[PDB]
Amino acid sequence: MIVPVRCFSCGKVVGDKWESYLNLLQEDELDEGTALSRLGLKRYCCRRMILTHVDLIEKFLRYNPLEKR
């Protein structure tokens, strides 16, 4: 639903690169392969972690909160 903290296979931290990945795609007009390598993700285990992630939390945040303070 949200970006995983670590790569499943090797455990490298990838949860601090989602916004950097999106910004590279949007403003720098980079292809996803170049963006993945620019972020330092070399092993294809780490590349698929960020490349295949679906950000569902953005969909869940469209519903109004159940309990507002």
Partner: protein, 49 residues
């Protein structure tokens, strides 16, 4: 992994691989057995129940 079994990485499992949420819902009603007998949602005590 012989005969259609597989080996999974415990480290990958620890990091969240193929982990899922399970939800179960329980339903209950306050039935009225006619005009006299009726139920209520209560915390029963061992001395009256």
């Amino acid at each position: 992994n012989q005969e259609d079994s597989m080996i999974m990485n415990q480290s990958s499992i620890d990091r969240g691989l193929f982990r899922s949420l399970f939800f179960r819902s329980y339903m209950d009603q306050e039935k009225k057995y006619g005009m006299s007998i009726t139920e209520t949602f209560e915390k029963p005590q061992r001395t009256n129940t």
